[PDB]
Amino acid sequence: DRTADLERARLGDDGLDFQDDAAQARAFAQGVFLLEIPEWLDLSAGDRFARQFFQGTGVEPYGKYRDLSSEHFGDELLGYHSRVDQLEQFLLERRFWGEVYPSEIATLGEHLTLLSHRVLRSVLASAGIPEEDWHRASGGCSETNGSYHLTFNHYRSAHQDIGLSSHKDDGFITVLRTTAQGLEVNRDDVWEKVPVDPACFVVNFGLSMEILTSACVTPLSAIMHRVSHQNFDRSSFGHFSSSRCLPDDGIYRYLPSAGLERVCGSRELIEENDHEI
Ligand SMILES: O=C(O)CCC(=O)C(=O)O
Ligand SMILES: [Cl-]
Ligand SMILES: [Cl-]
Ligand SMILES: [Fe+2]
């Protein structure tokens, strides 16, 4: 297979620092890039959670999360889920982290939320959207008011599926921590392997970002991606930012010189992407 050549960025004093302005433009136009993991941020507990959560109460300290199914939350989409592909997941929105996750996992989630916030604001500035529209345009993610899922993934190599079939993420921005081969992206109609680099996150955009920016100078895309069939197990985890969803408003497209036009609801966007994706 092809291997994607990705731009690398780091968080600095003025948001995202790519190598130069040209690289930033390639990165945002491709819809995927690498983000250097801050040296102070500890990912070891998250890594361990992704390796354990599916294993049940015999396995300490995280296997017990296997038992918190969807029926424990009111929200069908949270807790432990076996998927149709090799993937199984544990997903939790931020309003539940403090009560439900281990304290050190909630900490990791909070750090990733603030890191994702900085990345998103750097992207919004590059899109030419006026700053006073950012909070509504981002469904709260330009501050700390969005919906945030910290989601743990395990690929059951004993299952005869693709690892995770082709899809685009919901939401605005995904910060993905992966340390093993498997992720593939359809950059320019060709499937390419994402090179492994455990010192970087993989960052891409979701469908809400694509809708938002479709009329800008450089429309941004929610990149189609998948995880190939795994012959041996694999795990990963990701931080996913989407619009606030308190039972108000919904999903916007930015029109240069005019402001924000509502396209649909927060609800209808996720439930509709759940199927054909
Ligand atoms: O596990 C991976 O590398 C990708 C996971 C992913 O694409 C997702 O959870 O939406
Ligand atoms: Cl299982
Ligand atoms: Cl399966
Ligand atoms: Fe994804």
The domain limits of the chain are 2-276
Bond into 61 cis (ω within 30)? yes
Which amino acid, one-letter code, is at 244? R
108 lines ligand 1 (CB under 6 A): no
Pocket test residue of 225, 226, 229 for ligand 1, highest count of atoms within 8 A of CB: 225
Q: Would you tell me how many other CB atoms lie within 10 Å of the CB of residue 158?
A: 9
238 lines ligand 1 (CB under 6 A): yes
**CA atoms of 157 and 160, how far apart (whole Å):** 7
Ligand 1 atom, smallest distance to 238 CA:
9
178 lines ligand 1 (CB under 6 A): yes
Are the CB atoms for 88 and 56 separated by under 8 Å? Answer: no
Are the CB atoms for 172 and 148 separated by under 8 Å? Answer: no
Residues near 245 by Cβ (< 8 Å), separated by ≥ 6?
Answer: 147, 266, 267
Q: How many angstroms separate the alpha carbon of residue 259 from the centre of ligand 4?
A: 29
- The sheet with strand 173-178 has its strands ordered as 15-17, 8-12, 32-36, 200-205, 173-178, 234-242, 147-155, 87-93, 79-82
Long-range CB contacts (< 8 A, 24+ apart) of 267-271? 269/170, 269/207, 269/208, 269/211, 270/77, 270/170, 270/242
Q: How many angstroms separate the alpha carbon of residue 197 from the centre of ligand 1?
A: 15
Are the CB atoms for 40 and 31 separated by under 8 Å? Answer: no
Q: How many angstroms separate the alpha carbon of residue 47 from the centre of ligand 3?
A: 22
What sign does the CA torsion over 243, 244, 246, 249 have? negative
Residues with CB under 5 A from ligand 4 (ion): 169
Tokens of 195: 């090179």
DSSP string, 167-217: E--SSSEEEEEE-SS-EEEESSSSEEEPPP-TTEEEEEE-HHHHHHTTTSS
CATH assignment of 2-276, given 2.60.120.330, 2.40.160.20, 1.10.579.10, 1.10.10.10?
2.60.120.330
Token pair 């992206």 is found at 185
Which amino acid, one-letter code, is at 142? S
183 lines ligand 1 (CB under 6 A): yes
Annotated resolution, angstroms: 1.8
Q: How was this structure determined?
A: X-ray
**CA atoms of 182 and 193, how far apart (whole Å):** 7
169 lines ligand 1 (CB under 6 A): yes
DSSP string, the chain: -EE----EEEEETTEEE-SSHHHHHHHHHHTEEEEEPPTT---HHHHHHHHHGGG-TTSTTTGGGGG--GGGTSSTTSEEEE-SSSEEEEEEEGGGHHHHS-HHHHHHHHHHHHHHHHHHHHHHHHTT--GGGHHHHTTTTTTT-SEEEEEEEEE-TTS-S-SEEEE--SSSEEEEEE-SS-EEEESSSSEEEPPP-TTEEEEEE-HHHHHHTTTSSS------EEEPPPSS-EEEEEEEEE--------EEEEETTTEEEEEE-HHHHHHHHHHH-
